[PDB]
Design a protein around this ligand. Sequence first.
Ligand SMILES: [K+]
Ligand SMILES: [K+]
Length: 326
Amino acid sequence: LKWPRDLRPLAHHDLLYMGQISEEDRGDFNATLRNFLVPRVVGSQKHREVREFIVRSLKDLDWDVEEDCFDGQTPHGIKPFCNVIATLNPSACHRLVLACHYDSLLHKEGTFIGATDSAVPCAQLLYLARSLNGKLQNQKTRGDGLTLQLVFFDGEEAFERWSSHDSLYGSRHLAQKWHEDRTSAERLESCLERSEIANQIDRMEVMVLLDLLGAENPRFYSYFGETQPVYRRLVNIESRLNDAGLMELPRRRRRTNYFSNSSTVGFIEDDHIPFLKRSVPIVHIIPSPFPDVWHTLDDNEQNLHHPTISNLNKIFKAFVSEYLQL
Ligand SMILES: [K+]
Ligand SMILES: [K+]
């Protein structure tokens, strides 16, 4: 079955622009990232400060921001959680959803920054909102029934041994909440003709979940045949940026090959699962293998690879631009 939205290839002009990184672009991203490079354990002050920074940043861009807060039982007792959902145009029927988690693992060995997991993805979502603001605000005026939505999940990490009951606290909560919140096309702005909308989760056109980003040379695969048409746009955008010489490589005459044009045999549990189970199409932008620093105290700022982050930012900016026809 074909994708419900006809995917128009990005014009060369727009590809070149989205593939440019200025000195002030790099600086802005790094300033954003610095806010996240702190321990962010569930219920802590720094975690609250990070949430407040996310909320203020997006409110300042005139997005609608909801703080979805609740208390849930964990192996460490009752804990407070708060998901952040930012929506560019609440009224638009369909959402391109980009997502990550903002909590950091409570590590048995001590202070854990979780730079790739997922401080970098958090910063990337805010950077996209900031850097594309003018174009996004223009797109919102179109009445075309599509918008951008950013979800920063709380409580992705397990408190003890990962299990169905100990992990994904924010995502399980939000997926259930949206599934049980009934609605219809008649109540929404410009739904696609053959849309089956019965609840809020049906409005999530595709969920692009970013996780474990920021290490050198990540390898991505299409984890879901359902979203192959969307995934292939990431492959194409990467190829086009390389052809144009817009990727940062350590030597001349190399290419990035992050987005493999294959599928893989790999089952990864993450915040997409509760949405996947409710028929939300998923693109999971997570590397396989995981970065070597995964869940170690070495998942820190200095182990980030900035040229890779810059390259990913170019791909993501071009992707959002293509999908929303910015
Ligand atoms: K121009
Ligand atoms: K993790």
